[PDB]
């Protein structure tokens, strides 16, 4: 797809239909939002994107298998759970990497929607990722400069994307979440404190949900309410479509958005803004070594299709 | 003292390399005043036009 | 880079208005058609360097026709001398120059 | 902007330049300039920003003033000659006014002030067009009237352009402003040989166009507009920054790279006309341009700067947009010195 | 200030992995062959054969030729009474002095 | 002459298409073979130069320098194998290609028949050198050093370009043969004076004249070992070769215009030798010694007597070899102690015995010990200058005394005394380093048996 | 422009030192007025009086430099009896540079200006004697 | 030349000086542009009529057409500045420096 | 502008018909080989930029680069040779038609000319 | 980094341009016209003050 396709006649407004919507199922840690998102995707027929983790980009690029931590992410959620005030900047590095992963995820979702026409059901979004960062800052895990860098990066990337038509939020309370975590099994998750979850909920209910309600509809369900997929699906099928700036979109802005989301490097252009925060600033020697290690991975040396080691052939005529 | 510091590391360098680079830096600061106002360099254009008409006839 | 596509393809896009001696509607001649014709025919093919110095009399006549600077200077001198003579009473304008004789048809 | 509308505007800019380079009537040259400005302003403002609007307004004001002065010069030449053809202008005052107007259009100093601002305001895509294609028409007009050009005024403008371009380039950290000042210096270099030999001006224009196309396309391929942002490109794509270093060395005028061709031929032609002080001063002043190019080469490839953690994700993806002319422009701007005797084809 | 690798330890002695090292690379076989190549093509060829080639280089400087010509000229000058070396590099009869 | 140019070019695809375990081996093999082939250029005629074609020629001045370059390339590879061992394959290939391009450019400078082609290539030599100095240098001063060097050279050389083009326009040709046969005297007008300067200052910057020498210490200290090797062995002799080539069209104005440069060099030799007496950095001491040695070549060229030119050529070859070996020894010491401070590591005569002998022999050659070619060149230049003026002998003798003093002081400070206690990383010297020193020394000692080869075209 | 140039050059070297100095002063004053106008245009003064003061300072500096250069060159030509020696112009240029340093009240500026100005004035004198063309007419 | 030519050239010069000397508003600069265009129209028209260059009587109309095209360009740029800054003041155009 | 205003010059014509009287550049010309080398380097840089095997990937693309560069270089060299031949022809004709401006000089041998000797002491 | 390579006291106060060159929009909101469609108006039935 390119300017030629738009000129020749390929317009996205034709592809958009009743169920051509992007749905973000939000919620606090271990709120069961994933099952609700999957059930919404199954019944509405939309495509389901599992929440973007550290190795989400590894799934879309290459073999779809996660790479090493040294190469893909240089951060650990388990380390953040164990030591959230580490001097390695692992907390903010993980937060920035997760924001970048969700930015790529949103781009892939919008692309899929604008090309195939099928709707998308995402778990949380770049618009909801700031909740974790604000919780970390309130807990004191990250300093003010990290928050400033995150805001600077976000204000340059999120503006070029349309907010989701529907925002489904699960509202499992903090003590129930604590009980689920202490029964989940993962000791690292068990290491999560109470004020962290409380601040996550505070951010969700003070900034995200009101601001999202300013743009579009925001469906809300408790633990019991979210367990009825038919009830949640019926609400989506009868929401007022006026909500969201998507009706204010023509083929021009749609062409711009489709051009943007197809170029992943253009999507992630401002993720690597040259702000030299000690928490994310990788040194020259380490950068060189890690890049050389990445280049030596099978299939990661040349462009996709020209790596003879991974079975690609006809390269002389390709 | 008289050679190693005084001439080589000080005067020889001060006479040619250091002085020239400093002059170039000052001229760079002057030229790139970082103002960006049309009201100024359009007046400069007027002055230039008048001067060219006077000199080159 | 004067890419002379007009002379190559034979098209005439703007050479019809370059001079006043070219063809004009209803054959309305230019005020200095003769002088420009002489200047152009003199300086045709000999090059600009030669044309500046060789066909200089023709160009001077053309400029004089166009601007009449020297003719105006002569007329101004005549007018000034006539005014000076009238001030001293050394001259008397003729009746045909005083609006006393009927001009010929 | 609709792609059809953008293509029509680009074709209108090109048609204006071709009208300037094709007509034999002064009125049509002025018409081509007007069409170029009319179709260039929205191209400058393709991406709507306050900086883009400011750049468009400044460019429009400068080009409008230049076009008014050019038309006044044309009218005076008609008054004193009764001629519209592009030939030996017959009035010195009209010649001076036209020279000032054309220098303002080219950006020759002291009409250089708008170039760094308009270039910085617009994107790289528009900056490339502004610094490469917008120099064709005024240079062609100057080459057609080189006989009537007062050599003193043109030489003073060229020398001032080189000096000011070098001095301005030293204090700049924005890549677009560095490119604008380098363009000013190279325009001075081109206009230095206009009264002597126009084919050398054409050769310098071609070499500069190739070098600037290569540099701007590399910047687009790196999506870098500052030294710090360009520094990160060593980690993701070392080939791009190495080619950028080579092209910067070429722009400095260092042999055996292609950038030595225009300066060498210009010095030759100016020494053939017994001018020895002016080419020497120009060669010495080119060292400032060479200085800021070298500083950029250090920050980009010769030395490695600290990257950011998020470049790990960018490592996985490959560039989608493909500029087919970039390798050819890089090669022609670096390894064409063994081919100078091809100068005759430009005659 | 940055997440950077600790300075690598000072260059590991190649004697550690292979006590016979000859310097050069790390692989013992390529070390041996690099040493053989360097010593051979440096001493046995371009040094020995080079010095012999430059020692028996044919006399194109014409030193022996010049000496023989000088001997013949001296014989002619002394036998015939000529004053050995003249005082003019060119014959005055062909000089049109102002 | 293409018998040497074509293999030098073919070195590049060879190294680029060679396995990562064979770049150094192949490079060394074929650089040594190229040097062996270029040895055939030493068969110079007595009077006429070897005119291979319209573009390339070689006389008894060009041939020794060509052989020196073709011989020095393998030495540079061997010296640079060590520190460039953990680098990636692509960057190692890039470094090798930079060295090859430098060698090719040097060959085409020393063989060029046209002054403008000579200028083009002799300024083209800057790019590989600058890159080598600013990319693979170890310190943070490598960036300033590269700028100083580059800008000193360019500010010297651009007026040379202007003057060469002016001469082409006026005389009709820049070919060395034609410009030598169709030579004409220069008048004492200011225009001729400034043409003389424009032609002279470019090479005066290259072989560092006292006052324009500030770039040499920075360049030689901050650059890697191979870069310092070329800069000291060939890139300084470029200026001397250019001056000896161009002085043909600069007479008789030289007689009167050489006084400032003659005095500058004859005092700068003493000044720089005294500076060497009080240096704390080994590489800086070697660089200032190089300045002092090149002052003699400058004097010899500016005097324009046959003995002066012979001494200049001999000194150029000898000094190139000696300075390259000294830089290699300093590089070994640095790679051992990771510091260039002379007083840091002491008593190396007891830990590295053979390296001590190499240091001793290199210092003896540096101080012009008979019958080394260093002394041959120095004595020829001294005799020429004494014939020029008897007063010169005072400065010449003082310079010789101070050179011996600082060379033996370096030998005593480095390879003598009590060993540094805390230093424990001094391992036994490798076969590679000893072979490098042997390849530096043996041609130098052998040249004393056939000094006629490096005595220049005036022998 | 060329009127002042021929008002200065037509005066023979080492003759009419007062008139030569006056012509050099006029040239310097014109240059200073040009510089003042450009400075006012590019770097606007806060008040009209401030602009007048800036113009006066620049004009006085330039005119003093020109007057000192002319007087020094003519006096050197008179005393040394060598009208065609560039050393006279070198001394005049160094004197002008010293006056520039005095006006700016900086010894380093004074010394640097003396050196560069003296060199440039000597170059100008050499070009006048030999016939060097800064702006060469197209001849090919 | 006749005095009317002098007056029209002086009017063009005055309009050019006015355009080059901004005060506050961008509207007045466009006014000076239109004034210069009008002066050029009058000059060209007088020249064509006086010399009876019949075929060139269409030149002033083309000049006027492109004049009001430039005026429309200026007006559109003016509205964008006002939309982006609230006033058409020329001082708001300050982001781009040097 | 020299050759631009030559009589009979047809505008926008790359090779005039009179150029055919000159020998075409040989297909083994070193300049043509250098044009092919430039094309090959362009192909290598194209491979390098797109992150594919530099020396093996896309043989057809590199072949096209070389062919186009050689083709345009051949035509460019032919035009250059034609223009230099035109320059020499015009110079010779002008010299022949202006004998006064280019007079033969008296040929004095060095035995007759007095060139001053400047000693080197 | 920064606006210029050799900043001065005046220039040091000036910050680098935005990363995407999008200058933050100004808050100089355009004021409306509070026309008084007052009582006297014929369409206001004589006793209606309409502040629009």
From Swiss-Prot, chain B:
Annotated S-S bridges: none
Chain ranges passing through the membrane: 36-56
Top-rank taxon, per record: Eukaryota
Subcellular location: Mitochondrion inner membrane
Quaternary structure and interacting proteins, as annotated: Core subunit of respiratory chain NADH dehydrogenase (Complex I) which is composed of 45 different subunits.
Function: Core subunit of the mitochondrial membrane respiratory chain NADH dehydrogenase (Complex I) which catalyzes electron transfer from NADH through the respiratory chain, using ubiquinone as an electron acceptor. Essential for the catalytic activity and assembly of complex I.
Family in the record: Belongs to the complex I subunit 5 family.
This protein's name: NADH-ubiquinone oxidoreductase chain 5
Gene: MT-ND5
From Swiss-Prot, chain D:
Enzyme Commission identifier(s): 7.1.1.2
Pfam family, one: NADH_dehy_S2_C
One MF annotation (Gene Ontology) recorded for this entry: NADH dehydrogenase (ubiquinone) activity
Reactions catalysed, as given in the entry: a ubiquinone + NADH + 5 H(+)(in) = a ubiquinol + NAD(+) + 4 H(+)(out)
Keyword NADP: no
Membrane topology field: Multi-pass membrane protein
Record key words, sorted: Electron transport, Membrane, Mitochondrion, Mitochondrion inner membrane, NAD, Respiratory chain, Translocase, Transmembrane, Transmembrane helix, Transport, Ubiquinone
Any one Gene Ontology BP term: reactive oxygen species metabolic process
Enzyme class, broadest EC rank: translocase
InterPro entries for this protein: Complex_I_Subunit_2, NADH_DH_su2_C, NADH_UbQ_OxRdtase_chain2, ND/Mrp_TM
A GO cellular-component term linked to this record: mitochondrial inner membrane
Predominant place of localization: mitochondrion
Spans through the membrane: 3-23, 25-45, 59-79, 89-109, 149-169, 178-198, 200-220, 237-257, 274-294, 325-345
Keyword Membrane in annotation: yes
Compartment(s): Mitochondrion inner membrane
Similarity comment: Belongs to the complex I subunit 2 family.
Subunit composition and interactions: Core subunit of respiratory chain NADH dehydrogenase (Complex I) which is composed of 45 different subunits. Interacts with TMEM242.
PANTHER family per UniProt: NADH-UBIQUINONE OXIDOREDUCTASE CHAIN 2 (PTHR46552:SF1)
Function noted in UniProt: Core subunit of the mitochondrial membrane respiratory chain NADH dehydrogenase (Complex I) which catalyzes electron transfer from NADH through the respiratory chain, using ubiquinone as an electron acceptor. Essential for the catalytic activity and assembly of complex I.
Listed name of the protein: NADH-ubiquinone oxidoreductase chain 2
Record organism: Sus scrofa
Gene that this sequence comes from: MT-ND2
Curated annotation (Swiss-Prot), chain F:
Major subcellular location class: mitochondrion
Record-given protein name: NADH-ubiquinone oxidoreductase chain 4
EC class name: translocase
Gene Ontology cellular component list: mitochondrial inner membrane; respiratory chain complex I
Reaction(s) catalysed by this chain's protein: a ubiquinone + NADH + 5 H(+)(in) = a ubiquinol + NAD(+) + 4 H(+)(out)
Database matches in InterPro entries: NADH4_N, NADH_Q_OxRdtase_chainM/4, NADH_UbQ_OxRdtase, ND/Mrp_TM
Recorded name of the encoding gene: MT-ND4
Primary role: Core subunit of the mitochondrial membrane respiratory chain NADH dehydrogenase (Complex I) which catalyzes electron transfer from NADH through the respiratory chain, using ubiquinone as an electron acceptor. Essential for the catalytic activity and assembly of complex I.
BP GO terms, sorted: aerobic respiration; electron transport coupled proton transport; mitochondrial electron transport, NADH to ubiquinone; mitochondrial respiratory chain complex I assembly
Lipid bilayer topology: Multi-pass membrane protein
Transmembrane domains' residue ranges: 22-42, 60-80, 98-118, 147-167, 193-213, 224-244, 257-277, 284-303, 308-330, 351-371, 391-413, 435-455
Family from the record: Belongs to the complex I subunit 4 family.
EC number: 7.1.1.2
Pfam family, one: Proton_antipo_M
Location in or out of the cell: Mitochondrion inner membrane
Record's subunit section: Core subunit of respiratory chain NADH dehydrogenase (Complex I) which is composed of 45 different subunits.
UniProt source species: Sus scrofa (Pig)
Keywords on record: Electron transport, Membrane, Mitochondrion, Mitochondrion inner membrane, NAD, Respiratory chain, Translocase, Transmembrane, Transmembrane helix, Transport, Ubiquinone
UniProtKB/Swiss-Prot annotation, chain H:
Main location: mitochondrion
Top EC class for this record: translocase
Entry GO terms, CC: mitochondrial inner membrane; respiratory chain complex I
GO biological process: ATP synthesis coupled electron transport
Single GO MF descriptor: NADH dehydrogenase (ubiquinone) activity
Keywords: Electron transport, Membrane, Mitochondrion, Mitochondrion inner membrane, NAD, Respiratory chain, Translocase, Transmembrane, Transmembrane helix, Transport, Ubiquinone
EC number: 7.1.1.2
Subcellular location: Mitochondrion inner membrane
Reactions accelerated catalytically: a ubiquinone + NADH + 5 H(+)(in) = a ubiquinol + NAD(+) + 4 H(+)(out)
Transmembrane regions listed in the UniProt entry: 1-21, 29-49, 61-81
Topological category with respect to the lipid bilayer: Multi-pass membrane protein
Highest taxon in the source lineage: Eukaryota
The protein's role, per its UniProt record: Core subunit of the mitochondrial membrane respiratory chain NADH dehydrogenase (Complex I) which catalyzes electron transfer from NADH through the respiratory chain, using ubiquinone as an electron acceptor. Part of the enzyme membrane arm which is embedded in the lipid bilayer and involved in proton translocation.
Subunit (UniProt): Core subunit of respiratory chain NADH dehydrogenase (Complex I) which is composed of 45 different subunits.
Family: Belongs to the complex I subunit 4L family.
The protein's name: NADH-ubiquinone oxidoreductase chain 4L
Organism this protein belongs to: Sus scrofa
Source lineage: Eukaryota, Metazoa, Chordata, Craniata, Vertebrata
